[PDB]
Tab-separated table of N, CA and C in Angstrom:
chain	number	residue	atom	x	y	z
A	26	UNK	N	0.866	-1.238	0.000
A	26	UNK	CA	0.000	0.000	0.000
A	26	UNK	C	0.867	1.240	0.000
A	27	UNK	N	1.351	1.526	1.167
A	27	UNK	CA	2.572	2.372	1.326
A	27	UNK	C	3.545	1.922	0.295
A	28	UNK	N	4.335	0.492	0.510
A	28	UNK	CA	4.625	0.013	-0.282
A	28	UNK	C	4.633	-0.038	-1.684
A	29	UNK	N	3.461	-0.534	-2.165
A	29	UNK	CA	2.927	-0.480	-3.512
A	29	UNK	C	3.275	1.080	-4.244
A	30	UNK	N	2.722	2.214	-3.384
A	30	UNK	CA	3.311	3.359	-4.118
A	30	UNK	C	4.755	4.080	-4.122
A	31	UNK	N	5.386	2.857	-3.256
A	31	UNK	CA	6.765	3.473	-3.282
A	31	UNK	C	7.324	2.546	-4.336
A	32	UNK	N	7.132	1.351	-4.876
A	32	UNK	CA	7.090	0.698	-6.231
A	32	UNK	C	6.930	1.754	-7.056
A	33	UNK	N	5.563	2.264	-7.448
A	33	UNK	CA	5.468	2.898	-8.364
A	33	UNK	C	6.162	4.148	-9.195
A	34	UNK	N	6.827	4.870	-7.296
A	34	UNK	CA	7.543	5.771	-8.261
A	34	UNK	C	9.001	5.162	-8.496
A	35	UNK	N	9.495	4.115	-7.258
A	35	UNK	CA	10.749	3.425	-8.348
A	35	UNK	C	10.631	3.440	-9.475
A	36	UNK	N	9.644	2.362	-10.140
A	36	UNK	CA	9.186	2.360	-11.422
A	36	UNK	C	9.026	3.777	-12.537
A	37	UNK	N	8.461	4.677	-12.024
A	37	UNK	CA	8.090	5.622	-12.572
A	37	UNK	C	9.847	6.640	-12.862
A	38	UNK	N	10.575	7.070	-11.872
A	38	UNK	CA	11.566	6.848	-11.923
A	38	UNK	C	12.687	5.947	-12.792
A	39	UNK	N	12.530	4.898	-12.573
A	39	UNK	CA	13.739	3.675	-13.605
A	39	UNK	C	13.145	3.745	-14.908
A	40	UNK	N	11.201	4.170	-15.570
A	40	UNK	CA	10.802	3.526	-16.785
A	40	UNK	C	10.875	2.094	-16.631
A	41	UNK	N	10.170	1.121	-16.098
A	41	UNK	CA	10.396	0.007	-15.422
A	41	UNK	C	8.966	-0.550	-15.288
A	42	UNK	N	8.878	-1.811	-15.479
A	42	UNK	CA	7.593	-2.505	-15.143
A	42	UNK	C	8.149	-3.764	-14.495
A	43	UNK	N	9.595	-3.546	-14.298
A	43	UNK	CA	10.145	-4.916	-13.540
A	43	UNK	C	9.438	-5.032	-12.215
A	44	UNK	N	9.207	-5.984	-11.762
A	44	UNK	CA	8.899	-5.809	-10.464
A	44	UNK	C	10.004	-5.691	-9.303
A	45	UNK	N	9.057	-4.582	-8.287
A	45	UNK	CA	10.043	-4.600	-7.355
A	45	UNK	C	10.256	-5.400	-5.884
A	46	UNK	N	11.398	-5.766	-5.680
A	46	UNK	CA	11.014	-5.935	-3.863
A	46	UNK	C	12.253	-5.789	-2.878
A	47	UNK	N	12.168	-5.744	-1.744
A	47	UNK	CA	12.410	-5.482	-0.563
A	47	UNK	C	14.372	-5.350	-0.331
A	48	UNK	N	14.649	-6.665	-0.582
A	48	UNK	CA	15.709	-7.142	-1.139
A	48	UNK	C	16.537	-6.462	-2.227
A	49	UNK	N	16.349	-5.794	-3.496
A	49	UNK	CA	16.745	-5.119	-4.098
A	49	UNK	C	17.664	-4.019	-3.998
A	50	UNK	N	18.765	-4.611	-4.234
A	50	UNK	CA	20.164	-3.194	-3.911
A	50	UNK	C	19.961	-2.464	-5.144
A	51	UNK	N	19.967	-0.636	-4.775
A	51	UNK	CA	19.362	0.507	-5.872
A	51	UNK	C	19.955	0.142	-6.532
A	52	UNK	N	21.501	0.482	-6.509
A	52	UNK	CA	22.425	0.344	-7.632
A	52	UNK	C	22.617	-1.038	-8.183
A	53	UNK	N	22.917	-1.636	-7.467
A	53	UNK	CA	23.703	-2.960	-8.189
A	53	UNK	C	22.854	-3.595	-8.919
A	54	UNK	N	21.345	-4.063	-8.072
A	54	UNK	CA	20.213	-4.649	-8.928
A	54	UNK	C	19.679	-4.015	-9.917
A	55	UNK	N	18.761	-2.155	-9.267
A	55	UNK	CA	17.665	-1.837	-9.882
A	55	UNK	C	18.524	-0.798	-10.889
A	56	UNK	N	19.716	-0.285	-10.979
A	56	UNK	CA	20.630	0.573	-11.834
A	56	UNK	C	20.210	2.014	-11.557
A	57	UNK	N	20.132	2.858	-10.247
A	57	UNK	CA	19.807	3.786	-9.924
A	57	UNK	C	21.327	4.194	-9.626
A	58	UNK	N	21.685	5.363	-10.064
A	58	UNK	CA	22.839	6.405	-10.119
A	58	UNK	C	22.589	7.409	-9.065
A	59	UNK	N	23.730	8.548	-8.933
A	59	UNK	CA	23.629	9.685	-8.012
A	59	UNK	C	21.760	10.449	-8.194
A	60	UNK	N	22.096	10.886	-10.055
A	60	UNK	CA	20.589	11.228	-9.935
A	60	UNK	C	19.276	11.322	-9.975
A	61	UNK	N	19.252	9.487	-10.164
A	61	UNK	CA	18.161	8.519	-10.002
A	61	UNK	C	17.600	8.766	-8.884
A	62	UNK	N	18.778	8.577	-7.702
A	62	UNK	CA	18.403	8.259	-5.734
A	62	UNK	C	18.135	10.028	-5.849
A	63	UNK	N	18.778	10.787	-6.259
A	63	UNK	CA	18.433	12.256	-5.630
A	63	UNK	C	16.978	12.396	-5.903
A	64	UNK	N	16.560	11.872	-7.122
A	64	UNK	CA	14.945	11.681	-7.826
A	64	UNK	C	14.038	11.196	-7.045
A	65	UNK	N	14.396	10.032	-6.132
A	65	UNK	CA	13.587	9.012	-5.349
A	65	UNK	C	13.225	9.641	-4.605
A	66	UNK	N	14.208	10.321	-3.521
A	66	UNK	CA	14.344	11.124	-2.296
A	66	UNK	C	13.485	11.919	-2.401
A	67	UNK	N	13.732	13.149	-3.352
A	67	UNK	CA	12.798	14.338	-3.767
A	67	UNK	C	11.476	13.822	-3.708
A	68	UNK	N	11.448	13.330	-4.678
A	68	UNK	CA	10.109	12.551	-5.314
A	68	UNK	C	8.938	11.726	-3.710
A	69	UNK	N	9.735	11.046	-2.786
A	69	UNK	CA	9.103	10.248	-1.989
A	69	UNK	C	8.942	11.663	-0.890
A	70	UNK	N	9.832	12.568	-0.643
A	70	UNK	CA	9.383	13.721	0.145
A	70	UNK	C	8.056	14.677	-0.565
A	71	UNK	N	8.013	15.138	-1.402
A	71	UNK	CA	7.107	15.527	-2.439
A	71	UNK	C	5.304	14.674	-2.070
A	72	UNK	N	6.014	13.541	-2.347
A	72	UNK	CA	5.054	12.648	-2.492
A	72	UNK	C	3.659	12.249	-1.053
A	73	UNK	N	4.886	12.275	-0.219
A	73	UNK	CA	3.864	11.693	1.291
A	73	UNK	C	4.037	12.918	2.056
A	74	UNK	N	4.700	13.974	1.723
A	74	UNK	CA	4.928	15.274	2.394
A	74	UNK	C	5.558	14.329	3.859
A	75	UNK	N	6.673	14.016	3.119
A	75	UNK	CA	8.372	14.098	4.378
A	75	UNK	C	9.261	14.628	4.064
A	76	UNK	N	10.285	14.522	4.789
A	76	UNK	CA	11.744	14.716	5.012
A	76	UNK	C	12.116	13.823	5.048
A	77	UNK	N	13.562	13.584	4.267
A	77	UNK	CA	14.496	12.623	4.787
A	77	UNK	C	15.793	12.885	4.967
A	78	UNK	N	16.536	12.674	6.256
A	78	UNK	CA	18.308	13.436	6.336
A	78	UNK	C	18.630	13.266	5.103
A	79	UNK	N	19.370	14.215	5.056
A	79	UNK	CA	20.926	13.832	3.742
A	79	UNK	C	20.938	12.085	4.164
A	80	UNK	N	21.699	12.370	5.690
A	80	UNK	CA	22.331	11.312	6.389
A	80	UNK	C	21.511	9.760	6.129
A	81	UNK	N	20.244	9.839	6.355
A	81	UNK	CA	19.788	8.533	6.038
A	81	UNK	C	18.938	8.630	4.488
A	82	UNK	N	19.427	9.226	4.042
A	82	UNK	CA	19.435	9.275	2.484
A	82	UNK	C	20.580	9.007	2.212
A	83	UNK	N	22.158	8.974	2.398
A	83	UNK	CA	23.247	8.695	2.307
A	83	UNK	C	23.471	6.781	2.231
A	84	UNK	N	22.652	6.433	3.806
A	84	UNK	CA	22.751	4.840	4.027
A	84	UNK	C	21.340	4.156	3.094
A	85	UNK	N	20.645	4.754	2.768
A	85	UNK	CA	20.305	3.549	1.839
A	85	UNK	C	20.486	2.860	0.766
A	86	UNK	N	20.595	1.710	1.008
A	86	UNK	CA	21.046	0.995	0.085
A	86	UNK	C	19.763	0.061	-0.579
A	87	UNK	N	18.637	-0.632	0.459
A	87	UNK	CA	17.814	-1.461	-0.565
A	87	UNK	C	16.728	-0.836	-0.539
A	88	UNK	N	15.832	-1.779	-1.773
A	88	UNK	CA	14.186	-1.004	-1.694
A	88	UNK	C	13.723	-0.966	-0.218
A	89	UNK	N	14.409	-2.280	0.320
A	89	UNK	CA	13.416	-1.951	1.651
A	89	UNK	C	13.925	-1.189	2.575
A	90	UNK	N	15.271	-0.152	2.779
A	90	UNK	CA	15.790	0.743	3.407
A	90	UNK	C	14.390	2.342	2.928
A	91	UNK	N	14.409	1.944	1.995
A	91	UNK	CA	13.878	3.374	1.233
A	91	UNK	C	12.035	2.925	2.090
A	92	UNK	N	11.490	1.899	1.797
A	92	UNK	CA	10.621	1.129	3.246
A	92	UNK	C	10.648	1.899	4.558
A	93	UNK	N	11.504	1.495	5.150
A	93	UNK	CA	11.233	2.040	6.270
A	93	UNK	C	11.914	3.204	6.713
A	94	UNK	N	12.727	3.860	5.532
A	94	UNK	CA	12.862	5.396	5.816
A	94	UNK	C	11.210	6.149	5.653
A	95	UNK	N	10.120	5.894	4.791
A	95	UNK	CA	8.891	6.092	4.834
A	95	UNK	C	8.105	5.496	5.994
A	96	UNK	N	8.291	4.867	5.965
A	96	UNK	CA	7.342	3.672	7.092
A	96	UNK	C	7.529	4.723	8.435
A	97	UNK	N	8.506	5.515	9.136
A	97	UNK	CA	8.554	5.990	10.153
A	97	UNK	C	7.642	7.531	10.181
A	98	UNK	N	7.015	7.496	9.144
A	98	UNK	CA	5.973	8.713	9.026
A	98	UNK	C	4.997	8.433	9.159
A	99	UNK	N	4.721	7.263	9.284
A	99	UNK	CA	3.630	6.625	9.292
A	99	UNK	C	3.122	5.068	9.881
């Protein structure tokens, strides 16, 4: 749900109908660059009206980091 729309803007983001999940390292798996993740960030603050540090915008590494950097707003 939460979830599901944080898929979507991965997706929407990458041009992607791959599916996503939890497990998924940005870079190595899903091919997200410096200004892919700066996109996500923006985009998921924008989106659910948050914030996220630089700092724990710095440590994520999987879909499901980017999970429960959202998940704590809610």
């Amino acid at each position: 749900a939460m979830e599901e729309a944080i898929n979507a803007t991965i997706q929407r983001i990458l041009r992607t109908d791959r599916g996503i999940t939890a497990n998924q390292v940005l870079v190595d798996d899903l091919g997200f660059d410096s200004l892919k993740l700066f996109q996500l960030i923006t985009e998921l603050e924008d989106e659910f009206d948050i914030a996220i540090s630089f700092r724990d915008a710095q440590n994520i590494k999987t879909v499901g980091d980017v999970y429960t950097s959202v998940a704590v707003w809610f």
